[PDB]
Amino acid sequence: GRVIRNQRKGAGSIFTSHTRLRQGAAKLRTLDYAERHGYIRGIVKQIVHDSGRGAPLAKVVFRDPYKYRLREEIFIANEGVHTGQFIYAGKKASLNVGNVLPLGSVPEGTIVSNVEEKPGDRGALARASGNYVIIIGHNPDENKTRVRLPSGAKKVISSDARGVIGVIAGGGRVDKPLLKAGRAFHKYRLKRNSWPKTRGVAMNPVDHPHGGGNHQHIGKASTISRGAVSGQKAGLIAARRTGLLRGSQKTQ
Amino acid sequence: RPRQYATVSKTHKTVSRAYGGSRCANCVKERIIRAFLIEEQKIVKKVVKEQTEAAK
Amino acid sequence: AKFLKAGKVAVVVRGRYAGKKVVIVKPHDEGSKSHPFGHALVAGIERYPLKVTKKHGAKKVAKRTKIKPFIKVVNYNHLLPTRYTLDVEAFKSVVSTETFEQPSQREEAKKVVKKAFEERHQAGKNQWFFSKLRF
Amino acid sequence: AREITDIKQFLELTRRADVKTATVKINKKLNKAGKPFRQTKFKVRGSSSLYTLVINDAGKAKKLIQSLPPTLKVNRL
Amino acid sequence: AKRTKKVGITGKYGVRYGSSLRRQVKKLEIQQHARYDCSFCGKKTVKRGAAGIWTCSCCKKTVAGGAYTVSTAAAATVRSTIRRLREMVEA
Amino acid sequence: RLLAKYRDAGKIDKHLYHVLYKESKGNAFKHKRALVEHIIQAKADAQREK
Amino acid sequence: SINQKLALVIKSGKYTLGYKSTVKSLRQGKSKLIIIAANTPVLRKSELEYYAMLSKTKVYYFQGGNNELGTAVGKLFRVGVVSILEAGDSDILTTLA
RNA sequence: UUUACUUAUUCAAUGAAGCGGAGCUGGAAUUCAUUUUCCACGUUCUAGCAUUCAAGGUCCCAUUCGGGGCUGAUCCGGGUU
RNA sequence: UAGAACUGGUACGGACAAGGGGAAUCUGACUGUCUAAUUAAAACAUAGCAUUGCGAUGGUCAGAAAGUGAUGUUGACGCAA
RNA sequence: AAUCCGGUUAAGAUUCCGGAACCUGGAUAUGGAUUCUUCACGGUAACGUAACUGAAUGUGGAGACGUCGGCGCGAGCCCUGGGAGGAGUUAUCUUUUCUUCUUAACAGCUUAUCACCCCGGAAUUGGUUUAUCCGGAGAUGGGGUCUUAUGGCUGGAAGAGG
């Protein structure tokens, strides 16, 4: 049996990201003294398109406090920002759309985005276009914060972690029908070599486990265990349920 | 072309204002007005604290 | 009401002297024969006196306090009139319409303006008019 | 390259002590459409460039050739 | 004239793709290619380029926004939420 | 530009000019002679309404 | 509201429209009131406040944008700032300015 | 018990830059003797500016033309956080 | 560009150049791809629909290991199956 | 970073020959300009002028950019009129048929959309594009400034080439 495609993505030869036209990593401002005590202002000079990413980036330029220069950093644009806007980072920053505040200083029910997991990693959670997390609770005991991640799976993070206020720009993006195969081509050509995926049913018993047969069918069950080994895992991994759902949403 | 500028006289690479060859007219004009009025407005933000914080 | 009277400090916002502080010495509101627009004859300074310290030597003070003045006709739209003011009757009679064309007279006028503004920079009245507007 | 128009400047050029050679070219043209005339051109060789002076009148060129420094290597025609 | 009965812009796709997908694309491309009102200069010039980015044609201000419209309804509530939550700190 | 040279020649005012311009951006005028005879017609109507 | 008052101004008084002509009337001191739209830029807003304090003419802010102010003065085009210089039957020189 | 530790091991960021404790003014705070207490402790109409051991103040040096010390910028422990 | 006489042994896109059409059914929606040296298809792909895993001291995958790596100049409107 | 033309050999040429240039690196003088208003004047302005100090350090620009569609303008070509030469056909006809009439890199003066500046104040809304955009955040109109891709004129250069 041949080594199959989904195993083969991991040597990462042709399946890498296509990072040429990317403006930069979209990290937040490095947490320094001016941020965790007072606050600091930048002008956002140009908000600019990014390739592969859906949401636009934003050129927020801060003054370096320690030598006379300018440090120009790349935010994900919140929706509603504009060029020329002042952006105030810090613990005592006011709460307007685009100021990046620690989560220890926001009231509960505040809609933030680009929020950090551990404080000091510069922007991990809730970053794709149109997402946000919501602070639903605080905990002044051991200073934690109870947030709602965009998949609904709620989380408790440190309150020294930082998040920027507002939705992320590019909303309603996946509502348009990507009418034809060419648009999917020019979409995924600036991301990676994932496309076009051939079904494993069509291919051969060397090529895949769903191959073979004198009929296009799967053979055994398509759900494979979590504990099964790399190479078998081609299908619905560790699937607890399957099939089409019933009932109304917003589950308990 | 960028290296041609090395030969040519300075009057080809400059207009005689402040921020001459690098910012245009009106932008210079705007960063006077802004840079004036702000540091006039900021003067008021010291005489507010000489009146409010004194009357505390 | 009429706030372009003959003592106001302005900041010139167009022309070669953009961003430099003048005073109006004689406003012409209605206009003139030429210049069919409200222009004021201004006297300003072109190089600023650089900031002297406790430790500059005697002659090194003098080279720091040199002032290069200028005279100009300027339109009202090219001025920011500010709330400041300046006692200008020292050289009120020097700047005129006769001070211009016949340009040899302008250097004799600039000498008078330079003498007056150095005599106000020494004994440092008008601290705002003598620091560089910075932008 | 250059064309230099002043006669006095041209005499300054011919005394520049690095102009080694000069030449005179006699061309023939005609005013407006009417009548032929003799144009002359004086060309002095600089160390970089080559200066010319167009004289459309014979009565001034006749004295101007006489005004040349005799140390100058002149190629007439 | 008025040249198509119902398709309008999506008539450039012709016959293809099905009609529900084409009516769905029409409903968004009218939003996308229309010319919007500027929040600052008061003119009607904000046209997107570069999906998510809404430049004004004069005035040079550049509002990040929705991918297919200026600010979607599930975003303009958020600032109103902020407009509410900034008030609990003082009054 | 027949419209333009009639405006610059003072044989028409700016209001009738701006009417006729957007009329000529639609069809309304097959050729130069037809528009000149239309200028005569509307201008004589305005003269009779003077 | 305030709009009926400006309408009585605009049919019974003397006024001037838009920034450059306000500053022409203001440096000549014919100004008596200036009305600024809300979406005016903050720099132009400050430049008109600062010219107002030299003439000591009080500033009223028109709550509402420049399109609404363009309608409110009876014109059709947008206007950013109005300068009332001679009021007629209306009394907004003395109401709350 | 799973509690508490940081020094092993582990993770992450920074041209390892302002940690930890104490004090200093204000101020919530009510005094049950006098302060028992905690918060603050330079920047928010603006697409401007911010760089020369820092100006100022104060003591030297040997007055040259300049240099030096302290403060402006609270101490203490060197545990980058 | 339209039109009119007039004329040719009714000839005239004069050589060249240059669509056969219609009623239907099975099937794949389409445009696209492939067994280069026997198969270009009803296969493959695709949009569209749906499902499964996953909140990074993670999901999938690589490596003999390693202070190693791909997706990741990523963060659930995303990645992976 | 920076060059072209004309000619040349049996076989090389943007490389050789003749002419005309430029660019870099480094030397250096002379003139000019600046100065006793010690580091230039002019213009309301856009900016102009042969020049007209300037370190560390910071900022900005050029380098620097998709594809399609018409539209304008240039270059070369194609066509074509008069004229100065040469070759062909001529039983008849044809002021006829073919052909040469060329100008470089570089330099100086000058030349445009677009953009910008001044005066002015717009609804009996006005400009304007093949294509509907623009104006009280100041249009139309009067008058100016700039880029010089490009084009003209003069030099190169008619002494070359035909």
Side-chain angles (χ1 to χ4, degrees), chain A residues 1-251, chain B, chain C, chain D, chain E, chain F, chain G:
Chain A
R2 191 185 301 274
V3 166
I4 70 174
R5 181 188 71 229
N6 70 30
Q7 301 198 24
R8 207 178 70 195
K9 284 190 181 286
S13 63
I14 64 174
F15 296 98
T16 62
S17 179
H18 288 179
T19 163
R20 175 181 66 90
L21 292 173
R22 286 169 167 84
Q23 300 292 321
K27 298 172 186 289
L28 291 169
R29 173 168 175 161
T30 305
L31 186 141
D32 47 354
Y33 179 85
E35 191 166 4
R36 52 183 159 88
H37 292 274
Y39 69 95
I40 190 162
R41 182 180 69 187
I43 46 181
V44 46
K45 291 299 288 184
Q46 193 179 4
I47 56 105
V48 68
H49 181 80
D50 195 0
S51 301
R53 192 186 308 277
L57 299 177
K59 300 179 184 67
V60 169
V61 51
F62 286 136
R63 293 167 60 250
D64 186 67
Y66 302 99
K67 191 181 179 181
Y68 175 68
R69 61 180 179 170
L70 273 68
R71 285 199 285 126
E72 178 175 359
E73 286 170 352
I74 294 168
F75 285 165
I76 302 176
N78 281 326
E79 174 169 357
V81 306
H82 65 282
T83 55
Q85 196 183 12
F86 287 159
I87 290 302
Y88 297 98
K91 195 189 80 168
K92 291 182 178 180
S94 65
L95 198 144
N96 296 115
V97 189
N99 298 317
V100 39
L101 286 79
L103 279 80
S105 288
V106 289
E108 64 187 4
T110 298
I111 297 171
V112 304
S113 67
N114 198 359
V115 56
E116 302 182 1
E117 282 179 349
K118 297 184 289 290
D121 59 346
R122 301 168 66 188
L125 302 164
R127 287 169 74 191
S129 66
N131 288 323
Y132 53 87
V133 309
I134 304 164
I135 293 98
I136 61 164
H138 290 281
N139 195 359
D141 297 331
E142 71 188 7
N143 61 14
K144 295 296 185 71
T145 300
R146 183 173 174 179
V147 299
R148 176 178 286 167
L149 291 174
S151 66
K154 303 198 290 291
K155 195 176 182 179
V156 44
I157 66 170
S158 178
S159 297
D160 288 329
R162 288 172 294 173
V164 69
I165 305 298
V167 288
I168 288 175
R173 180 176 61 83
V174 287
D175 293 337
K176 193 176 186 179
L178 200 60
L179 281 184
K180 57 188 182 180
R183 289 177 181 173
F185 180 79
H186 294 287
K187 173 187 179 186
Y188 286 138
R189 72 107 85 90
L190 296 97
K191 284 180 172 64
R192 70 197 65 86
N193 198 1
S194 63
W195 198 70
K197 301 187 183 75
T198 311
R199 292 174 284 110
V201 167
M203 54 192 70
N204 280 111
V206 284
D207 287 331
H208 198 69
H210 298 176
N214 293 323
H215 295 278
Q216 275 187 359
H217 67 91
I218 303 170
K220 295 180 177 292
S222 76
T223 69
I224 315 103
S225 172
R226 177 56 54 84
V229 74
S230 293
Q232 305 183 351
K233 287 180 187 175
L236 308 167
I237 304 159
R240 50 184 55 89
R241 77 176 308 283
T242 178
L244 187 59
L245 297 167
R246 292 290 176 85
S248 180
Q249 296 298 109
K250 290 182 180 178
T251 186
Chain B
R1 298 296 298 172
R3 195 163 183 173
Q4 311 279 321
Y5 291 117
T7 64
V8 199
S9 178
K10 191 183 183 289
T11 63
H12 289 89
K13 299 188 288 179
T14 301
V15 298
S16 292
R17 278 175 276 104
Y19 284 99
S22 181
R23 313 300 154 103
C24 72
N26 298 322
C27 294
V28 166
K29 176 174 180 179
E30 287 178 355
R31 71 172 64 186
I32 286 166
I33 307 299
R34 181 170 287 111
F36 170 69
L37 288 175
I38 285 179
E39 295 196 358
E40 191 68 31
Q41 180 72 254
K42 190 182 289 182
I43 289 299
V44 177
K45 296 296 180 183
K46 291 295 189 291
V47 77
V48 171
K49 301 299 188 71
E50 288 183 352
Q51 291 175 355
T52 298
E53 292 172 348
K56 185 182 288 185
Chain C
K2 188 71 182 295
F3 63 95
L4 290 177
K5 291 166 70 65
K8 304 294 285 181
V9 170
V11 182
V12 178
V13 78
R14 288 285 175 89
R16 175 159 54 97
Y17 302 107
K20 292 183 189 291
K21 301 178 184 178
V22 298
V23 303
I24 298 167
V25 303
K26 177 60 176 66
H28 294 277
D29 195 78
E30 184 65 30
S32 172
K33 184 63 178 57
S34 69
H35 314 285
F37 48 89
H39 70 283
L41 279 77
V42 299
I45 55 105
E46 180 173 358
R47 282 199 304 274
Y48 287 85
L50 306 173
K51 300 186 179 71
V52 71
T53 189
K54 188 178 180 69
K55 300 185 296 298
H56 287 303
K59 293 182 182 180
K60 302 292 174 67
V61 171
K63 300 295 187 290
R64 287 295 185 93
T65 60
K66 298 297 183 69
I67 289 171
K68 190 174 180 183
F70 65 96
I71 53 181
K72 182 63 176 177
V73 159
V74 72
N75 189 1
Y76 281 165
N77 298 320
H78 299 158
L79 293 178
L80 284 169
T82 188
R83 60 181 172 86
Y84 290 87
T85 185
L86 182 56
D87 178 75
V88 79
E89 288 290 327
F91 56 96
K92 180 73 177 294
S93 68
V94 172
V95 179
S96 298
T97 305
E98 67 183 1
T99 304
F100 293 150
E101 187 73 22
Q102 293 298 109
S104 68
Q105 186 171 356
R106 299 187 192 182
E107 293 183 355
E108 293 293 328
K110 286 184 177 68
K111 291 183 183 181
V112 175
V113 179
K114 183 178 184 292
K115 183 196 289 185
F117 288 169
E118 288 183 354
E119 288 183 355
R120 291 185 189 272
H121 184 68
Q122 301 293 324
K125 297 176 71 174
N126 303 104
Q127 185 178 358
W128 188 70
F129 184 74
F130 283 156
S131 71
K132 190 194 290 179
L133 198 146
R134 191 175 179 89
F135 68 103
Chain D
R2 293 181 178 178
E3 177 178 358
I4 285 175
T5 64
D6 187 7
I7 302 99
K8 182 178 183 296
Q9 182 182 1
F10 186 72
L11 298 174
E12 291 180 353
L13 294 170
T14 54
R15 290 188 298 272
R16 203 176 70 186
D18 49 356
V19 172
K20 290 176 70 175
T21 59
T23 180
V24 176
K25 180 63 174 61
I26 302 303
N27 301 328
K28 180 171 72 72
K29 287 186 180 292
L30 53 94
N31 65 0
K32 305 296 295 300
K35 291 178 184 178
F37 74 97
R38 175 258 191 90
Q39 173 180 355
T40 183
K41 288 186 182 179
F42 294 93
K43 304 181 191 182
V44 293
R45 176 64 188 166
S47 291
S48 66
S49 52
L50 176 71
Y51 301 137
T52 186
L53 174 60
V54 171
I55 309 299
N56 291 317
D57 188 76
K60 295 181 74 69
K62 185 177 179 180
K63 278 79 176 175
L64 198 147
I65 298 166
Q66 187 59 255
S67 297
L68 262 71
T71 60
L72 182 59
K73 287 185 182 292
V74 178
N75 190 0
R76 189 176 295 112
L77 276 71
Chain E
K2 183 179 72 176
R3 293 184 297 272
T4 53
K5 181 178 180 180
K6 69 167 77 174
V7 288
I9 168 168
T10 192
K12 69 186 181 180
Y13 303 131
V15 196
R16 272 79 54 83
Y17 299 139
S19 68
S20 302
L21 302 187
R22 277 187 278 112
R23 186 170 62 247
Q24 187 53 248
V25 178
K26 176 186 175 180
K27 185 176 177 293
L28 297 173
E29 287 183 352
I30 297 173
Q31 296 183 358
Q32 193 180 9
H33 296 167
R35 196 191 297 270
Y36 286 104
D37 303 335
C38 184
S39 299
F40 313 106
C41 66
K43 296 171 191 170
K44 185 180 286 293
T45 54
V46 179
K47 290 174 69 69
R48 60 170 276 284
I53 294 173
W54 291 88
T55 65
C56 189
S57 295
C58 66
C59 164
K60 304 298 188 291
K61 299 295 180 180
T62 309
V63 180
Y68 295 133
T69 183
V70 182
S71 182
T72 177
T77 184
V78 175
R79 64 185 67 184
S80 72
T81 291
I82 300 300
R83 180 70 180 172
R84 179 180 60 83
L85 292 178
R86 189 170 63 249
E87 296 293 323
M88 296 197 301
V89 178
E90 295 87 5
Chain F
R1 60 187 153 86
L2 188 135
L3 263 57
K5 70 181 183 179
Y6 275 169
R7 189 186 69 197
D8 290 338
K11 289 176 73 69
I12 198 167
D13 57 352
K14 61 186 179 180
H15 304 88
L16 182 58
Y17 170 77
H18 197 83
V19 171
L20 289 176
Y21 186 85
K22 300 169 85 74
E23 285 188 352
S24 298
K25 183 173 166 61
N27 287 321
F29 299 110
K30 186 177 186 294
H31 50 81
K32 182 177 184 291
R33 185 187 68 204
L35 177 137
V36 169
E37 293 186 357
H38 188 274
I39 288 170
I40 297 160
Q41 180 58 250
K43 187 174 181 291
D45 288 328
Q47 183 176 0
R48 287 194 296 271
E49 292 294 324
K50 189 179 292 294
Chain G
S1 176
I2 191 67
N3 310 118
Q4 186 72 40
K5 297 179 182 292
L6 297 176
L8 183 56
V9 169
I10 213 76
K11 76 176 181 68
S12 70
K14 287 186 285 185
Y15 62 95
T16 183
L17 301 174
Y19 161 72
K20 282 169 62 180
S21 57
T22 63
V23 175
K24 288 182 192 290
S25 67
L26 183 53
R27 298 191 308 257
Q28 285 193 353
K30 293 182 182 294
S31 171
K32 297 293 174 66
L33 180 59
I34 61 170
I35 287 96
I36 296 173
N39 58 3
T40 205
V42 191
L43 182 67
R44 190 80 53 81
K45 191 172 182 178
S46 293
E47 188 187 7
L48 292 166
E49 292 181 359
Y50 190 78
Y51 286 169
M53 73 181 289
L54 294 174
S55 68
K56 295 181 72 175
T57 297
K58 291 179 285 293
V59 180
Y60 169 67
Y61 294 163
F62 183 80
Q63 188 167 1
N66 53 6
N67 285 311
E68 289 85 0
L69 186 59
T71 306
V73 296
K75 302 292 183 181
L76 280 74
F77 49 88
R78 54 179 62 90
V79 62
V81 51
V82 184
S83 174
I84 309 302
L85 51 87
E86 288 294 324
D89 198 2
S90 176
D91 51 357
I92 62 173
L93 301 179
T94 60
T95 55
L96 62 93

